Amino acid sequence: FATLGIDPPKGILLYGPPGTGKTLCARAVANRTDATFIRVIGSELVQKYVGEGARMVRELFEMARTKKACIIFFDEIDAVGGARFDDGAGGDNEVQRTMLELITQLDGFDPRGNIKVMFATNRPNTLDPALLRPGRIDRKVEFSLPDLEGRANIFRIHSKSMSVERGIRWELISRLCPNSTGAELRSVCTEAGMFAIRARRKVATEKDFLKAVDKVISGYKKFSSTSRYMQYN
Amino acid sequence: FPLPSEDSRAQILQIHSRKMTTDDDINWQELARSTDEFNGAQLKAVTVEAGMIALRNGQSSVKHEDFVEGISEVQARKSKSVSFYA
Amino acid sequence: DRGVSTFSPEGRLFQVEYSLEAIKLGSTAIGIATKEGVVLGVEKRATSPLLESDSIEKIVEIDRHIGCAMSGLTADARSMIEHARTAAVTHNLYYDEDINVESLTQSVCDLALRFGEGASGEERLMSRPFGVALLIAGHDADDGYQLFHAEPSGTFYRYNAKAIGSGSEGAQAELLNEWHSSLTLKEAELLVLKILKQVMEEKLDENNAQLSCITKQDGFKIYDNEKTAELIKELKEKEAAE
Amino acid sequence: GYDRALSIFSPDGHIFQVEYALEAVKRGTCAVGVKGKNCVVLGCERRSTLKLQDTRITPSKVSKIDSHVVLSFSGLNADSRILIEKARVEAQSHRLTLEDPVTVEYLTRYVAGVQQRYTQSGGVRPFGVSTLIAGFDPRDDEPKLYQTEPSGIYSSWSAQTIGRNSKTVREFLEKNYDRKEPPATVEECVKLTVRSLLEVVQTGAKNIEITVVKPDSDIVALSSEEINQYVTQIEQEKQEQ
Amino acid sequence: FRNNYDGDTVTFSPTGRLFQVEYALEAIKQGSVTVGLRSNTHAVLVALKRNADELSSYQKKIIKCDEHMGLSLAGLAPDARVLSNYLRQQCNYSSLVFNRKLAVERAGHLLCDKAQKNTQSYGGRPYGVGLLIIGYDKSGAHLLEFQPSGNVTELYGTAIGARSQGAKTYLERTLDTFIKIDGNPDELIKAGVEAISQSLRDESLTVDNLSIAIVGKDTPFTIYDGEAVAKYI
Amino acid sequence: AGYDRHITIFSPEGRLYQVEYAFKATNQTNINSLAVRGKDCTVVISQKKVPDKLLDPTTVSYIFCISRTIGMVVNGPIPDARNAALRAKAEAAEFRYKYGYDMPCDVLAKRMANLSQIYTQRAYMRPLGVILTFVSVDEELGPSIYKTDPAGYYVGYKATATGPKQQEITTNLENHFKKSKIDHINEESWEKVVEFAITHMIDALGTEFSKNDLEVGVATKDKFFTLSAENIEERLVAIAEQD
Amino acid sequence: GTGYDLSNSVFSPDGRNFQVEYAVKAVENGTTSIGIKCNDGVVFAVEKLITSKLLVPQKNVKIQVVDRHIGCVYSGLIPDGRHLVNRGREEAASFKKLYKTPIPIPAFADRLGQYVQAHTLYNSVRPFGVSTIFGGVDKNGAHLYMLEPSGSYWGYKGAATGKGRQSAKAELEKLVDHHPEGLSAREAVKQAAKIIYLAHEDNKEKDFELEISWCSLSETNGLHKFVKGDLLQEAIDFAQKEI
C-alpha cells in the first residue's frame, strides 16, 4: 500500500450474532501474524477502585510502543461503551469514563498509534453512538448466517474429523437444518457420535443424522436458545 | 460546530487525497453532492476504502469507481450484508 | 418489541425481512411454465407414515384456467386464496370475462403490506403480513401461459421456471441449464419429477408429492395418484441411460 | 379497543405467539383417538391430581358439535369454549344458509380458518388449544378424523394423539396399528385406544373418558363400568404375554 | 445505529433530524436507478428495470396516470402503487368535478399531503419509494422529484436510484442543450440514454432493461417497452 | 421499569411525579403577579416583561378576557396559557345558551378545574403547565378570586399571587390583613384599589416599574376592562406624590 | 429516570419539554426567512438556498398565501410547513362561510396556535418542527405574527428565523431606530432585500434566491402578491450596492 500512498485502517469492527465463533476468527489471525497478541476482557478494564480503570487503558497502549507490530483484542465492550448520560441510577459515571480514556488513548490530540485495535461484543446497538462512527474504525464486517452453500462447508471441515460413512451427502443435512449460528452447526457432528452407544450403532450413519435433526435442532429449540433471538437487548 | 455543508465537503475530500495517487480526472464537487450530512472522519474514511479497492483489483492508481464503490460499502450511514433486491 | 411500521437501517420493514426467511422453513414448491402448459408441483413432506395423502393440499384452484401453489406456512395461504378467489370470481361478474393472471396477482399482493396499528385515513386491521409464498399460474387469450410469484414484500415477477421454499437456492440454479423455450408438456412433467426426486429425503412417490397442470382446453387439472405413479416409473428409465 | 399487534415474526422466521402457544397443549391432558372402517373412537383423559369431582355434573371432555360429529380437544380450557360455541352456531348457520347438514371436512377447515383470523388479527392472541374433529359425513360411512393445530394447519390422520406424552403414544400407534388394514369392528377400536392410555393415565379408571362415534347420528358414551371392562381384558393379555 | 432515539416516529433527534425519514430515504438510493429530463414542449422519462434472475421478467418501473402525464418509481414497488392510486384519484376528481386535467404543480402539493399524515402520526410510515412526476399543461412541461418526507421541487431533470446521483454529471454539462431543443423528440430521448449509461457498471442497457416514456404537447404519454426502445439504444 | 416517572401513576411513595413537575413549569417565564379583592370590585395586577423591542406592547398580555363579566390572569408559558383560555371561553358560552344567564366566577374556576382533573387521571394526556387565576364580581357573594391549580384543585383566596417570589409577596399581603383584621380593602373607589396593589408590589420587588412594565386588570360589577398605557401611567403619578 | 426525551407528553424534571427543544434545532437547519411590518401593511421576504444548477429559476413559490389577505412563509422542514397552511386554509374557508367577511390577522393566529398545541398534548403525534411567519392587512391597521414550534407567539414588528436568524433578525433592531415614526411599503421592499444579503455571510457557500411579497392598502389594497417586473430587479441593485 506504500505505492498508492494510502492509510491502512487502524481499527476494525466485528460484532455479529452470538454463536458464530467470532472469537475463533480473532485467534486465527494471531496464528498467521506470528507476533504478540493481547486479549482484553471488557470486565477487566473496570477495577475495584474509581479511577484505576483509567490507568488500565494506558497499560495496553504502553506495550504498543514498547512492542511493535502486535495485536490487541477487546472482548464484550458492551459492558463498557455507551453514553448512558446522567439522570440514571447515578453509579454509571465510572464506566463511561473508561471509553473517554480509551478514545483519548486511541485518537487524542496527538495521533499516536501503531498496531491494530479490535472491538468486539454481542450488542452493537447498546454501544456509544460515537463509538459506532468511523475515524477510530474503518473496516466494518458483520457476521451472517451461512446459506445452503455456506452451511455445507461447515460440515466439510468437520468431515475430516470424527467418522464419516462413505456415500453420505452432507448437503441434505444442512438443508433440513434451518438457519442457525455455527455454534448449533458443530453440535450436529458432536452429538452424532453420542448415538453410537444408546442407539446401537458402530459409526455415525445417515439414520443417526436424521435423528439429530429432531434432537440437535428441533429438540433443543424450546427456550433459552439464542441464535437470532436476541439481536438488540 | 455542526456537520459540514455541501460544497465544504468537496474541499475536505481533496485535502486527504494529497498523499494518494490518482489521475486527477475525478470531480470532487460531484463526490460531495453524493454525501449527505457525513462526519469529517467519515469523509477521510472514504479515501481509506478507495485505496483498498484498487489493491484487490490490482490497479496502479485510484480511479473514479474506487470512491463510488466505497460509498456502496460501509462508510457513513450505509450498511448492507446482502444484495436483497426484489 | 416495536411497531410493524418501523424501518430497518437498510431501508426496509422488519416485518418484510423476517417474512421472506419463513419461506425456506417450509416445504419446497417447484413449477415450470412452458408454451404448451404450466406444470406445477409441491411436496407434502409427511413426518409420519400415518398421514393421509388427501390431508395437506398445497395446490388450490382459483379458476378453471388459473391455478396456484403454496409453500412454507400454509396458515397465511388459506386466507389469501379466499381473497384471491374473491378478486377473481367477483371480477367475472363485473366485466363478464376472465380476470388477467397479471391483474389478479396485483390485487392479491396489495393485501400484504396494508397491515399496521391504527392506520389513518381508513380501516385496515391486520396483525402481520402473510408469511407464505404463492406461485400464480394461468393462461389467457393474449399473453399466454404465465407463472408469477407472490412475495410477502408486495412484489411479483414472471418466472418461466421457479423453485421456492427450501429449494430456492440449490434447486433454483439447477433449472437454468435444464430449461428451454421448446420444452413441451410431456417433457416438462419428467423434468420437475427429476428435481423433486433428488431434493426429497426418501424415494419419490404419489403420497409425498402432488403435481398439477394448467392447459388451454382442460384448464386446471390435478394428476391422479395412478397418473403420477406412471410418470415416476418413466423417470427411473431416464435416470439410468449410459 | 386494543389495536396493538401481538404475533410478530421472529428473526428465525417463526412466530413467538405460535411456538410458545404450542407448549400449552403439551402441558395439558393427552387426547388420543383412532378410526376404524365402520366406527371412530376418541379417547380422552382427565386430571388425576384433583379429586371429589362428580362425573355427571362435570361437562364432558368431548364436546358434541353435531349429531354425526363431535370434538375432543387438548389444551387451554379457556380458549376451547370460544371454539366450541362458534363451531356449533356455524353448524346451525350452515343448515340455515345452504340448507345442508355440515360435513366433517367443512367443520375442520372452518375451525382452522377461524384460528387463522386471530393469528392475523391485530389485538387478539391465537388459541392455545388443539382440537380433534371426528365424525361421519351425511349419507357417507367413510371415517373422517381431522387434526386442528393452534397454528391453523389441519390434516387427516388414521391414528393421532396430542397433549403430554404424545411422542410416546405416536410411536406405539405406528407399529401396533396399521393404516392399510384398519379394524372393521367396534370392540377392536375401543381396545386399541385403551392400550394407548396405559402409558399415560398410569393405572386409573375415573380419569378415563372414551367416546364412541358411529354413523347415522349414533353416539354411545362408555360409562365408568364399561371402560373398565375393556381394561381388565387387556391387562390379562399384557403381563401374561 | 438501529433504534435509539427516532425509532419511534413521533420522536425528534437531538441533532434536529429524523432517522425514520433517513431510513426511508436510503431505500431509494439502494433501489432501481432511473433518470429523467424535460424540455419546453416535451419531457423524457428513462427508467432501468432489474430482477433477481435471468429467466424472470422485469417489473415495470413506470406507472401511467393519464394520457397527459406519467411517473416513475425508484424504491419499494407496492408502496408506489398506493401513492399512484391517490394521484390517479385526483386526476379523475378534477376531471369529473372541475372538468380539468390535474396540473403537475398541484399534483405535487396533493401528493405531499398524503405522506405528511403518516410522518406526523404514530402507527403510520412514510413511503420509501421515489416518484418523478412528468406531464404537460398549458403552461409547459414540468418535472418533480418526490422524497419519503414529501418534499416537492421542480427541476429540469434528476436521477434517483443506485449510483443515480453520480449520473447527474452528464445532465449538468448538457443542461444548456436539451432545454433549447424543441420539436426534436428523438434527440431528447437519446439524451436520457447517455445520462443513465454513466451509472451502468455490471450490465448495460438492453431491450428488456431499457424503459422509456415520453410526454409532450402533440404527443401524449406513451410507455415504450420491448423492441420500441431498441432503436434508441 | 423506569417508565413509572414518565406518566401519571401511583408512586411507591404515594405521590404523583408528573404533577410535581407541572407546578415547576410556571416558573420558566418568571412573571410575578398578584390579585386583591376590593370593596365593591376586584383589581388584578401583573408584571409586563417584553424581552425584545420588536414585540408590540399592545399584543403581548398575560391577562385575558374570558367574558364581559369575568377576567383571567395566567402564569407560565403562553402556549399552555392560551390553550385553556379558549377552553374557558367555550364553557362560558355553553352556559349562557343552554343553562341560563351569564356565568359567575366560581363556576368557571370549577369547570376548568374538573376538566384538568380528567386530563390528569388519564395517562394519555399531559397536565397543563400553567395556573388559571380567575377574577370577577359575583352578584351574590360579591368580589371573589379563585385560583385553579394545574393539579385540578381549586380553592378561594383573599389576596393571591403567583410566581417564584409568591412566597415573598404573600408575606406583604398577609401582614397587612393581620394588623387591620380585615378580609378585603375598605376603599370603595376602584382607582385607589389599583394604586393599593401597585404600592405593595414595588416595595416587595424593590423595583420601580413603568407604563409598559405593568398590566393592571380591573374587574367591576358586570363589567371588565384592561387599563391602557395612559391609565396605568396615571396611577404611578399619584403614588409618587402621596408616598 | 431515563427516557424523558423520548416521547412528547413526558415533562422534564425542570418543567420543560425535550421534544419541543429538539424541534427548535430543526428550524435553524432550513432556509432563513425575514419579515417587515409597516403602517399600511407587512412585507415578506425569504432566501431560498439553491442546491445545484438543476433548479428552475423563479418557478418555485415557498410562500403559501391564505385567501388574498394572508401570506405565510416558513423556515424549517418543508413537509411540516405545508401542513400548517393547509390546516389554516380550511379554517379560513370555514370562517368565511359562517362569519362572512374574511378573517383578520390577529384572529387567524389563534387557529394555528391551538392546532399546534394539540400536537404537544398527545404521544401519538409530534409537534411541528417548522416556524411559520404569517401576516397581512386586517380590518383595523395591520399585524404580524411568528408561530414557534412551542406554539408561543405574539405581535412582532419584525420576524426572522433560520440559519441567519442571529444575523438578519439582529439587523431589524436598526430598522426601528432608522424609521421610528413609520416606514413606507415601497421602501420596505428594498430594505428587505438588504437584510437578506447582510445575513448572506453564512449562505455564501451556496447559491441563493430572492423572493419578496408584500400586501398593503396603499397600492394592492388587500392583495397579497409576489414582487415581479422591474420592481424586484430595482431592489436587488439597491441592496447589492452596500455589499
Side-chain angles (χ1 to χ4, degrees), chain E residues 32-39 42-48 62 70-74 131-135 141-145 154-161 164-165 167-172 174-175 178-179 187-197 199 210-215 221, chain G residues 54 56:
Chain E
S32 178
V33 62
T34 187
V35 296
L37 59 82
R38 66 181 182 89
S39 64
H42 294 83
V44 176
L45 177 63
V46 176
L48 178 62
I62 294 171
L71 60 82
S72 64
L73 62 85
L131 295 175
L132 297 175
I133 295 171
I134 61 172
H142 300 290
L143 189 147
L144 297 175
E145 183 178 2
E154 183 178 2
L155 298 175
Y156 295 97
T158 187
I160 57 173
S164 63
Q165 294 177 335
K168 294 176 179 177
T169 300
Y170 177 78
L171 296 175
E172 294 177 351
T174 59
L175 178 63
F178 59 88
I179 61 172
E187 183 67 14
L188 296 175
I189 294 171
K190 294 177 179 177
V193 176
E194 294 177 351
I196 187 169
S197 64
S199 63
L210 178 62
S211 178
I212 295 170
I214 185 169
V215 64
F221 178 81
Chain G
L54 296 174
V56 183

Side-chain angles (χ1 to χ4, degrees), chain C residues 1-2 15 18 22 25 47-52 55-56 74-76 78-79 82 117-118 126-131, chain D residues 3-5 8-15 109 116 119-122 151 153-159 174 179:
Chain C
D1 186 5
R2 60 179 61 86
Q15 297 300 321
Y18 297 141
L25 297 175
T47 59
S48 178
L50 276 66
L51 179 63
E52 184 178 2
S55 298
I56 302 301
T74 59
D76 291 344
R78 182 56 57 86
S79 296
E82 295 301 321
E117 294 177 350
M126 184 69 73
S127 66
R128 63 181 180 88
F130 298 98
Chain D
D3 59 353
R4 181 179 180 273
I8 295 170
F9 295 97
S10 65
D12 289 343
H14 300 290
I15 296 170
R109 63 180 296 175
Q116 294 176 336
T119 59
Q120 295 177 337
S121 178
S151 63
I153 296 171
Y154 64 91
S155 63
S156 178
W157 292 94
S158 296
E174 293 177 350
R179 62 179 296 176

Side-chain angles (χ1 to χ4, degrees), chain F residues 10-27:
Chain F
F10 295 98
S11 64
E13 294 178 351
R15 293 175 64 84
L16 296 175
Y17 296 138
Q18 293 299 321
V19 176
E20 294 177 350
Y21 298 141
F23 296 96
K24 294 177 179 177
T26 59
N27 291 336

